[PDB]
Amino acid sequence: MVNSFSGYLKLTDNVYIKNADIVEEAKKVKPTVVVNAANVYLKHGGGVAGALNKATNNAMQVESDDYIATNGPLKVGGSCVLSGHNLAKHCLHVVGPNVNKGEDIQLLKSAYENFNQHEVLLAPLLSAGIFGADPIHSLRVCVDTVRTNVYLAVFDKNLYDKLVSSFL
């Protein structure tokens, strides 16, 4: 049984990790679900969200603005399913707490629980990067929360090496 993903290191029964640009991984694999590191307003300005949105030629932002106009903002820890555009069938926009905004780090587990609604996902580490949480802590919450198959793309090589070498 051939896997659509390649080059991932298995961390647990269901969690895999790779030093890769999630945009490049999405273009290569076109997964059923790509996770975006969203904010409550779905304003995809920077980090993973800015990069995914730019890869969609801003179509993700246009769709997101219509979603917000209809539904209002998401909650920190919440998510919504929108189109994956050219990158995936769906994009699961998940809001991890942003430590730089003083958001509750306990909501990181709630954010990862959204992944359990999908059999397999291509995802970044929630609340990592510009969201300010410790990525080692995010990976621990991921492995202790997500039960579905998650393929984590870590953009930074030095961080990827540190995450693998410190994994328990």
mmCIF file of C-alpha atoms in Angstrom:
data_model
loop_
_atom_site.group_PDB
_atom_site.id
_atom_site.type_symbol
_atom_site.label_atom_id
_atom_site.label_comp_id
_atom_site.label_asym_id
_atom_site.label_seq_id
_atom_site.Cartn_x
_atom_site.Cartn_y
_atom_site.Cartn_z
ATOM 1 C CA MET A 1 0.000 0.000 0.000
ATOM 2 C CA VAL A 2 1.813 3.147 -1.432
ATOM 3 C CA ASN A 3 1.733 6.405 0.671
ATOM 4 C CA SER A 4 1.052 9.734 -1.118
ATOM 5 C CA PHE A 5 3.604 11.409 1.328
ATOM 6 C CA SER A 6 7.339 10.718 1.125
ATOM 7 C CA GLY A 7 10.400 11.259 3.254
ATOM 8 C CA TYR A 8 8.622 11.589 6.596
ATOM 9 C CA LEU A 9 10.130 10.355 9.827
ATOM 10 C CA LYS A 10 7.638 8.360 11.920
ATOM 11 C CA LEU A 11 7.394 9.719 15.461
ATOM 12 C CA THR A 12 4.436 7.660 16.723
ATOM 13 C CA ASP A 13 1.726 5.306 15.421
ATOM 14 C CA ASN A 14 -0.005 8.309 13.739
ATOM 15 C CA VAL A 15 2.388 11.293 13.735
ATOM 16 C CA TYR A 16 5.003 11.849 11.012
ATOM 17 C CA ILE A 17 7.430 14.750 10.516
ATOM 18 C CA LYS A 18 9.513 16.207 7.676
ATOM 19 C CA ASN A 19 11.696 19.257 7.108
ATOM 20 C CA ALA A 20 9.684 20.721 4.281
ATOM 21 C CA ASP A 21 7.918 23.800 3.117
ATOM 22 C CA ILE A 22 4.190 22.989 3.623
ATOM 23 C CA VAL A 23 3.338 24.942 0.428
ATOM 24 C CA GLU A 24 5.745 22.756 -1.596
ATOM 25 C CA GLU A 25 4.441 19.636 0.165
ATOM 26 C CA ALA A 26 0.846 20.650 -0.641
ATOM 27 C CA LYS A 27 1.665 21.322 -4.330
ATOM 28 C CA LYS A 28 3.390 17.931 -4.563
ATOM 29 C CA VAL A 29 0.836 15.821 -2.705
ATOM 30 C CA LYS A 30 -2.465 17.771 -3.044
ATOM 31 C CA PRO A 31 -3.606 16.220 0.263
ATOM 32 C CA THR A 32 -7.281 15.875 1.154
ATOM 33 C CA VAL A 33 -6.632 18.322 3.986
ATOM 34 C CA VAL A 34 -3.948 20.918 4.475
ATOM 35 C CA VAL A 35 -4.020 22.696 7.835
ATOM 36 C CA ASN A 36 -3.524 26.430 7.941
ATOM 37 C CA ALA A 37 -2.109 28.187 11.009
ATOM 38 C CA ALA A 38 -4.970 30.697 10.991
ATOM 39 C CA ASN A 39 -5.947 33.587 13.200
ATOM 40 C CA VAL A 40 -9.571 34.225 14.276
ATOM 41 C CA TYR A 41 -10.109 36.741 11.471
ATOM 42 C CA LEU A 42 -8.669 34.449 8.764
ATOM 43 C CA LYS A 43 -6.307 37.299 7.827
ATOM 44 C CA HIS A 44 -3.535 35.330 6.159
ATOM 45 C CA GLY A 45 -0.761 37.882 6.375
ATOM 46 C CA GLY A 46 2.376 36.048 7.406
ATOM 47 C CA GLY A 47 3.883 32.765 8.561
ATOM 48 C CA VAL A 48 2.248 29.618 7.261
ATOM 49 C CA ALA A 49 -1.032 31.437 6.492
ATOM 50 C CA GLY A 50 0.648 34.138 4.418
ATOM 51 C CA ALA A 51 2.616 31.501 2.521
ATOM 52 C CA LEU A 52 -0.411 29.235 1.840
ATOM 53 C CA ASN A 53 -2.534 32.205 0.825
ATOM 54 C CA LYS A 54 0.155 33.542 -1.569
ATOM 55 C CA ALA A 55 0.372 30.069 -3.172
ATOM 56 C CA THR A 56 -3.405 30.297 -3.888
ATOM 57 C CA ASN A 57 -2.917 33.724 -5.609
ATOM 58 C CA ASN A 58 -4.974 35.271 -2.738
ATOM 59 C CA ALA A 59 -8.016 33.057 -3.533
ATOM 60 C CA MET A 60 -7.791 31.699 0.042
ATOM 61 C CA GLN A 61 -8.049 35.250 1.426
ATOM 62 C CA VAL A 62 -11.035 36.132 -0.804
ATOM 63 C CA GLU A 63 -12.882 32.975 0.269
ATOM 64 C CA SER A 64 -11.925 33.640 3.919
ATOM 65 C CA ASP A 65 -13.219 37.235 3.853
ATOM 66 C CA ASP A 66 -16.581 35.963 2.558
ATOM 67 C CA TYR A 67 -16.591 33.309 5.335
ATOM 68 C CA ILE A 68 -15.901 35.957 8.014
ATOM 69 C CA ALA A 69 -18.501 38.344 6.550
ATOM 70 C CA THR A 70 -21.105 35.560 6.897
ATOM 71 C CA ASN A 71 -20.029 33.842 10.122
ATOM 72 C CA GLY A 72 -17.898 36.201 12.149
ATOM 73 C CA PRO A 73 -14.532 35.296 13.606
ATOM 74 C CA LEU A 74 -13.427 31.893 14.768
ATOM 75 C CA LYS A 75 -12.584 31.216 18.420
ATOM 76 C CA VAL A 76 -8.946 30.647 19.523
ATOM 77 C CA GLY A 77 -8.735 26.818 19.550
ATOM 78 C CA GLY A 78 -11.406 26.566 16.826
ATOM 79 C CA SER A 79 -11.399 25.831 13.136
ATOM 80 C CA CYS A 80 -13.333 25.926 9.912
ATOM 81 C CA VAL A 81 -13.100 23.880 6.721
ATOM 82 C CA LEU A 82 -12.747 25.874 3.537
ATOM 83 C CA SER A 83 -11.457 25.061 0.031
ATOM 84 C CA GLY A 84 -7.885 23.929 -0.399
ATOM 85 C CA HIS A 85 -7.840 25.749 -3.786
ATOM 86 C CA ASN A 86 -4.827 24.518 -5.830
ATOM 87 C CA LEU A 87 -3.065 23.111 -2.759
ATOM 88 C CA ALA A 88 -5.437 20.527 -1.338
ATOM 89 C CA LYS A 89 -9.088 19.369 -1.504
ATOM 90 C CA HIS A 90 -9.793 21.247 1.766
ATOM 91 C CA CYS A 91 -8.027 23.655 4.015
ATOM 92 C CA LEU A 92 -8.671 23.208 7.716
ATOM 93 C CA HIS A 93 -8.032 26.669 9.177
ATOM 94 C CA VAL A 94 -7.082 26.043 12.799
ATOM 95 C CA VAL A 95 -6.465 28.814 15.316
ATOM 96 C CA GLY A 96 -3.762 27.961 17.790
ATOM 97 C CA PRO A 97 -3.174 30.479 20.620
ATOM 98 C CA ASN A 98 -0.726 33.194 19.729
ATOM 99 C CA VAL A 99 1.612 33.707 22.676
ATOM 100 C CA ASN A 100 2.647 37.089 21.245
ATOM 101 C CA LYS A 101 -1.071 38.114 21.675
ATOM 102 C CA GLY A 102 -1.160 36.728 25.266
ATOM 103 C CA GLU A 103 -3.593 33.940 24.259
ATOM 104 C CA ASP A 104 -4.154 30.974 26.527
ATOM 105 C CA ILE A 105 -1.548 28.252 25.767
ATOM 106 C CA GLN A 106 -4.039 25.686 27.193
ATOM 107 C CA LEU A 107 -6.073 26.252 24.034
ATOM 108 C CA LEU A 108 -3.285 24.522 22.038
ATOM 109 C CA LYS A 109 -4.765 21.109 22.956
ATOM 110 C CA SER A 110 -8.233 22.309 21.859
ATOM 111 C CA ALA A 111 -6.709 23.547 18.590
ATOM 112 C CA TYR A 112 -5.131 20.113 17.899
ATOM 113 C CA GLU A 113 -8.445 18.354 18.684
ATOM 114 C CA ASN A 114 -9.766 19.800 15.401
ATOM 115 C CA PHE A 115 -7.358 17.472 13.563
ATOM 116 C CA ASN A 116 -9.268 14.434 14.897
ATOM 117 C CA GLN A 117 -12.182 15.231 12.579
ATOM 118 C CA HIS A 118 -10.003 14.286 9.546
ATOM 119 C CA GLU A 119 -8.487 10.885 8.764
ATOM 120 C CA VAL A 120 -5.253 12.348 7.399
ATOM 121 C CA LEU A 121 -3.808 15.842 7.330
ATOM 122 C CA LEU A 122 -0.744 17.719 6.115
ATOM 123 C CA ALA A 123 -0.092 20.287 8.869
ATOM 124 C CA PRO A 124 2.287 22.704 10.494
ATOM 125 C CA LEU A 125 3.026 22.629 14.252
ATOM 126 C CA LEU A 126 0.273 24.754 15.813
ATOM 127 C CA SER A 127 1.238 27.924 17.625
ATOM 128 C CA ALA A 128 4.858 27.549 16.429
ATOM 129 C CA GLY A 129 6.757 30.148 14.347
ATOM 130 C CA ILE A 130 5.257 33.621 14.559
ATOM 131 C CA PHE A 131 2.576 32.339 17.003
ATOM 132 C CA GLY A 132 5.330 32.317 19.663
ATOM 133 C CA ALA A 133 4.825 28.978 21.432
ATOM 134 C CA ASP A 134 7.664 26.521 22.031
ATOM 135 C CA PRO A 135 7.548 24.125 19.051
ATOM 136 C CA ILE A 136 8.867 21.279 21.266
ATOM 137 C CA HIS A 137 5.792 21.791 23.496
ATOM 138 C CA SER A 138 3.537 21.986 20.370
ATOM 139 C CA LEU A 139 4.871 18.646 19.079
ATOM 140 C CA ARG A 140 4.238 17.036 22.494
ATOM 141 C CA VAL A 141 0.635 18.348 22.548
ATOM 142 C CA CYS A 142 0.229 17.103 18.955
ATOM 143 C CA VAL A 143 1.372 13.541 19.736
ATOM 144 C CA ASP A 144 -0.731 13.461 22.938
ATOM 145 C CA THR A 145 -3.887 14.852 21.271
ATOM 146 C CA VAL A 146 -4.141 13.900 17.626
ATOM 147 C CA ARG A 147 -5.258 10.343 16.954
ATOM 148 C CA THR A 148 -5.670 10.660 13.170
ATOM 149 C CA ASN A 149 -2.736 10.538 10.711
ATOM 150 C CA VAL A 150 -0.855 13.818 10.723
ATOM 151 C CA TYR A 151 2.085 14.644 8.471
ATOM 152 C CA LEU A 152 3.893 17.598 9.998
ATOM 153 C CA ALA A 153 5.908 19.895 7.742
ATOM 154 C CA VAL A 154 8.544 21.923 9.630
ATOM 155 C CA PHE A 155 9.988 24.656 7.441
ATOM 156 C CA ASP A 156 13.110 25.385 9.482
ATOM 157 C CA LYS A 157 15.879 22.678 9.199
ATOM 158 C CA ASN A 158 17.541 23.618 12.509
ATOM 159 C CA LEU A 159 14.166 23.460 14.309
ATOM 160 C CA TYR A 160 13.318 20.134 12.562
ATOM 161 C CA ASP A 161 16.630 18.632 13.801
ATOM 162 C CA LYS A 162 15.987 19.931 17.323
ATOM 163 C CA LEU A 163 12.393 18.542 17.327
ATOM 164 C CA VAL A 164 13.540 15.082 16.207
ATOM 165 C CA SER A 165 16.605 14.906 18.518
ATOM 166 C CA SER A 166 14.588 15.996 21.594
ATOM 167 C CA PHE A 167 11.492 13.872 20.915
ATOM 168 C CA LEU A 168 10.114 11.746 23.734
#
